[PDB]
């Protein structure tokens, strides 16, 4: 992770 | 100065200094049918930016995570939930109808990777020069309570001419424009  | 937000139907928006600023976050959702595609002005600016980064020497790909529809989002979200659960997924992945990518104004730069030193150099480059092309790094460091999401170096949001002023403040769009952020419901 991390796209919101 | 604090302007209250205006519902346009499919989306909410706030009147910026030079342009209408569409608002999409955990507090302000978009409609299910809203399927605009990518913004051609923002598209033309990102292309210029990517070439500047590539010619600067950074490994940056010719493709990007640009527009994502509600439907795409529905399948993207649940996969991240599968991966890390729901509390951890919500920190970096929006539910269907809350993602800035659905607006056509948000794009994730891809690095292909991965020297780490090269990544953070690239991440700083964006902070220093993304405003030049009307973009801003949306999810800044230590702004997760305001924006709703943890820090993300590659997610750029096209705001246009006011990008320079917003970057110099060091604020989130929620703080700068003074509209609500935070969590759902
Ligand atoms: Mg799609
Ligand atoms: Zn993104
Ligand atoms: Zn208000
Ligand atoms: Zn609609």
Author numbering:
A (entry chain H): 2 to 5
B (entry chain A): -3 to -1, 56 to 237
Share the article's original sentences.
We report biochemical properties and crystal structures of the LD-carboxypeptidases LdcB from Streptococcus pneumoniae, Bacillus anthracis, and Bacillus subtilis. LD-carboxypeptidases subsequently hydrolyze the L-Lys[A2pm]—D-Ala bond to release the tripeptide. The LdcB enzymes are single domain proteins comprising two subdomains separated by a V-shaped cleft.
Despite attempting to crystallise LdcB enzymes with a range of synthetic ligands, one crystal structure was obtained, that of SpLdcB in complex with MurNAc—L-Ala—D-γ-Gln—L-Lys—(D-Asn). There are six molecules of SpLdcB in this crystallographic asymmetric unit, though none of the interfaces represent a stable multimeric form. Residual electron density was retained throughout refinement in only one of the five molecules, chain A, into which MurNAc—L-Ala—D-γ-Gln—L-Lys—(D-Asn) could be built and refined unambiguously. The NH2 group of the D-γ-Gln of position 2 is located in subsite S2, 2.3 Å away from and in hydrogen bonding distance of Glu204, an invariant amino acid in LdcB sequences. As expected of a reaction product complex, the lysine carboxylate is located adjacent to the active site zinc in subsite S1. One of the carboxylic oxygens completes the zinc tetrahedral geometry with His153/Asp160/His207, and the second oxygen forms a salt bridge with Arg120, which is either arginine or lysine in LdcB orthologs. Most of these residues (Asp167 to Glu171) move by 10–15 Å in the presence of ligand to open up the cleft by refolding into an additional turn at the N terminus of α-helix 4.
